[PDB]
Amino acid sequence: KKFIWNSEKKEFLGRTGGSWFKILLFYVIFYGCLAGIFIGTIQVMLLTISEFKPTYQDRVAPPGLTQIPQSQKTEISFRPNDPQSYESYVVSIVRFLEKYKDLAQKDDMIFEDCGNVPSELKERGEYNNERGERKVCRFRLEWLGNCSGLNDETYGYKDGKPCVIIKLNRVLGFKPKPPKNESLETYPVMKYNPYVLPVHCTGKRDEDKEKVGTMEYFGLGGYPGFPLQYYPYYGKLLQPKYLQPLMAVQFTNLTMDTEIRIECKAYGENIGYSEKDRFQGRFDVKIEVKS
Amino acid sequence: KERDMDELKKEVSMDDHKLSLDELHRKYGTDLSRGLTPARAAEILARDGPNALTPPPTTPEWVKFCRQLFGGFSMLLWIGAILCFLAYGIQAATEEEPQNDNLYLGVVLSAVVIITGCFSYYQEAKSSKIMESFKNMVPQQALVIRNGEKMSINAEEVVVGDLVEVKGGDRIPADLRIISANGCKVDNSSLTGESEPQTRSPDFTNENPLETRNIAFFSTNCVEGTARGIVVYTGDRTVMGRIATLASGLEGGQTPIAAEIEHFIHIITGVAVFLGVSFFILSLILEYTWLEAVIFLIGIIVANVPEGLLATVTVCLTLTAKRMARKNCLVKNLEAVETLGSTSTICSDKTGTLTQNRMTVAHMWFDNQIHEADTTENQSGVSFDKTSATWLALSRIAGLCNRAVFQANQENLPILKRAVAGDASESALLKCIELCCGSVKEMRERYTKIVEIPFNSTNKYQLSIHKNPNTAEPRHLLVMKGAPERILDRCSSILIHGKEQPLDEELKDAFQNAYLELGGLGERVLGFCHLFLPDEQFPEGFQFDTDDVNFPLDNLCFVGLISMIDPPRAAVPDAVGKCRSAGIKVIMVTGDHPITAKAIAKGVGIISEGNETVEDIAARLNIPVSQVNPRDAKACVVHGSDLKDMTSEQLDDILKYHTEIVFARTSPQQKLIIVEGCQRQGAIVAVTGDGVNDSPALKKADIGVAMGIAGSDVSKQAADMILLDDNFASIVTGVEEGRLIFDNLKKSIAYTLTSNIPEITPFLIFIIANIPLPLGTVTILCIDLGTDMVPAISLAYEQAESDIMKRQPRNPKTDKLVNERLISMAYGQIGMIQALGGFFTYFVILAENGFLPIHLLGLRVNWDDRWINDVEDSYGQQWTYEQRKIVEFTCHTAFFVSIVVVQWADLVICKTRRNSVFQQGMKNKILIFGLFEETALAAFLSYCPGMGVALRMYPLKPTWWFCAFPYSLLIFVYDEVRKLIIRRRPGGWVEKETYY
Amino acid sequence: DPFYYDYETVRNGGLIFAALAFIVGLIIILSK
């Protein structure tokens, strides 16, 4: 039943020789024309959008609160006694913070010195090539309290006091707006700088909150949040080496051999949340220092 | 050993009819005049079984449900489900939270199979239900003589060997051996097929137990006369009982449409497994693991199984079947609606199927002129000439010199289809006078009868003397009728143009040739004459004689002749002509005498004018038939006597070298043999019959056509198509609908198979280039089980692109339903453009949100990660899991909409195979409704509140609906120029490679 | 802000289109 091998009419696999050439040539021309038409339509579409401004951004609003080190299942578990069980977090933290090294922000044509205290949004202008490349607000690695990779390369994991550097999702043309102190009656006690997007970490249930211990916030000017002098973002085309604001949270005095789930939330008018997106404006990290 | 029982039943029957009255009563042990004692009845009744055929085997209701639930198409769906469903069972007992991508799919495929089974069961059940409301048969008891006393008992209470008396009007209970008859004429129509009622004589006449006159058969009605007989066979042991049991034990076979469906599944699996294995090699070449390679192979084979094609095909066949049901062309087999379209040889029955099985007045001879009376069933033929006085004389002789009339309830019934008591000839005459000369009720009493002389064996005559009607005053009218050669001798005066003339040989021989003309035409002639007794020489009051005949037997006035035969049905000739126009070979298979079969064949179209048989040429050359060459004869009459002594090779020789064949005097078993011979050639055969002798032929054939009323219940149950209106034109309608639905099936299948390319390609490249999923599974279900349902169904309402009844029947081994050209067009060209349009929309959406098409390469790795909430786009922005996932779902929805957009043009191009869309016109209202409903349904699936939460199909930005427009327009233009080139360049490479 | 899309207007327009297309199709199939 599978002897379509050959025939007296010079058939191979089912058809003759010249027939194979005719059909193969037709398919080559046909598929080539189809590919050319598709690439041409894709070119016109590429011409539709711009180089420094996406046509749609409502799918990225509000931004999300990401945490470093990034962890699978958002669990940061290790044995403080063993320097090997926490090497993954150290590697990821070092890899991410290497872009913020003191030596990385050398040139002035790209890196601009910005205030040591949070200031107003530094608007560099418009989104065009008229003003060429843009300035980047430098972020000193020392602004992170005890997890800087400057004095303790481990960042605290050596003596059971980890650090989870928090970061804000980059959004082109986004201007964070901290909540006015007039409406300050819902979020917990935090430092109030009208130029700082606040971030506060807490537990999740009546047990996690109790077993957490003591939170230690580290940031620019000692404010638990992000300074407004670093926004808005101008895309990767106008600001190639832009450094976003960072913040660190150290969980000193954590219950050993116990997994505690903590949630850090960034408050603000421009910051929303979602019951389906566990990372929109907030994030969850369950840590366990099982020595 | 049932293979031998079937052959034993196939063998012609034998009997013990040729036995002396003493020998017969000796073999069965029964009194010739008193029958048997009542105690002797219980000795046989509880011995072999009541006189009744064993009911057919019963197949419980749920059996058909399971039959449709399994099938062959449903089996492919069952295996596809099985793979997908068995995967989730192993997944549930191990992980914490799986995905429904395969579980929901498996349950959906299973539900599809079950739903199709439910719908099919409902339709077939309705067919059987209406068939049951039409087969309401009531018991008929027999008049048995036991202990010397007459008693009417149920037929089932009759046993073997007990005197049975059958009166004129009673149906023969069981097979009887006539011992004493009085002019009994049984109607062996349903059993042997003999149209003209055959008389039963107690004396043995022919060796054949059927042609002989001393045997009464089961299911035969005694037209007239009375007779006595001893029961020979009972229950299933009877002739028709054995024939019925043989029919119940025959194999139905494989319908042509089922074989086409199987071939289609074969090609489907061919591409499925081919793509699966080739992509398995490709996946491994891309350095993927064997675990993933097996996963891919299974996914490719499964994704290549058309789920929605089952319901579409079922409803597609149901629509045409309903159109058949509207014209009384009921189909018990759902797939039997197409069998007619593939038929290339129709074997028809003569008596009952082609003819009306009703002796009717055909021609009349008066004033030396033949007058053909209309022989139609609905009275829609050319009216004869009735203005001369001779017509009045003939009508008087016929209406007056006739024993009986209609019955009690025969008042509202039509003149033709109403019952009449008496001989068939008398009924034909009565109907002719009732339709051409007013009425016979008041015409018979107006001429009071005095002395009537019925038919006699010696000096055969049938006359009667009546009184004068009005004031003409001749005072008497003696009417007589009989054989033309006998009535001609006892006549001297001849009525012509109104007056009288002598018996000159000049016109006497004209009458002779007229008799031979009507005889050779295939009719039964009867001469009619009357005479006015001169009241001056014979009294006006009371003067008659009966023992020493006084009325002048000779010197009568001959009026004319009246021929008669069972005429063919109204639409039979035109239907045969139409079937021959489409290339269908019409072959007659009857058990009637050849003298009548040849004439009916020449009159209906089975034998055209000019074509001579092996006998016609010999008669035209005055030479023995053994001299002429059979190749010179286009048509031929095959006698059943010679067919018995034939081999398998000779039958093939008869069918090949002869176009117009007429099989006469063929037993039911020989009909089955002829059917098998026709099937040996490899051509589709369709048998049309009515009597029980057609049951084996209607069962073995690819499709049997039975008469709703003129057909017996046995052959009606053994057939596959019922004609409730008996309109033989339904055969022409059925073949037209079969070919039409075949073409529409090709179109709908192409439409469904074209959507699989842009369905599988997103997942294929999702694995190949490692890009975010362009199209999800839920959307695929919304396409094959949603939008495309109506367009695929509406493609069945399409109509002929040319004269379908002009082309030859399709070749089973050459013209396939789904060939490689269809795959080349759907999977090769149209589907490819649809896939390109979908990818265009995908890149458009992603690039507009910041993820340029270039940046999407290799992004799936971290795109599917649920914890990498800082995915950078081409603009440097960081996206969380749910944000990019929302973009993926709002991208999948647009891909589905793109599928609908390209499906518009795909439906338009698949709507026609050769003609242009403008030559055919989009007059298919269901198709336009399909486009509107499809578009509206898609828009609803995207903008309904809660879809991004229920089906994860987010609303689309309006500017997306025009992304696939240029692609659909391109598809339409390309296929249009393709069909235009095929139209202006037939037989070219374009047609030989793309015409599906 | 450019970070807001009037999904309500487009959604309502889509529902309106679906209703109109469906009733029009019904008119064509239930033609008189």
Ligand SMILES: *[C@@H]1O[C@H](CO)[C@@H](O[C@@H]2O[C@H](CO)[C@@H](O)[C@H](O)[C@H]2NC(C)=O)[C@H](O)[C@H]1NC(C)=O
């Ligand atoms: C950061 O690290 C230093 C260590 O260099 C911490 O020093 C603590 O000093 C206080 C005050 O005497 C002691 O109570 C603690 O025991 C010291 N801790 C350790 C680990 O040595 C210091 O508290 C840390 N945090 C801050 C906010 O400065």
Ligand SMILES: CC(C)CCC[C@@H](C)[C@H]1CC[C@H]2[C@@H]3CC=C4C[C@@H](O)CC[C@]4(C)[C@H]3CC[C@]12C
């Ligand atoms: C040979 C000629 C006729 C082909 C010309 C191609 C035209 C018809 C094609 C090429 C580029 C296409 C456009 C490219 C970009 C966009 C923007 C998008 O948001 C919707 C589709 C839309 C609006 C396309 C519509 C059709 C379009 C204008």
Ligand SMILES: CC(C)CCC[C@@H](C)[C@H]1CC[C@H]2[C@@H]3CC=C4C[C@@H](O)CC[C@]4(C)[C@H]3CC[C@]12C
């Ligand atoms: C035979 C073929 C060409 C008919 C093509 C139908 C075209 C004209 C119709 C069918 C589907 C329609 C779209 C369906 C849904 C929407 C969303 C709505 O909120 C605005 C209109 C919009 C964007 C429609 C525009 C017009 C449209 C594309």
Ligand SMILES: *[C@@H]1O[C@H](CO)[C@@H](O)[C@H](O)[C@H]1NC(C)=O
């Ligand atoms: C952890 O340490 C702080 C130090 O100020 C102490 O007040 C607190 O009670 C401790 N909490 C737990 C839960 O051990």
Ligand SMILES: [Mg+2]
């Ligand atoms: Mg018949």
Ligand SMILES: [Mg+2]
């Ligand atoms: Mg059959």
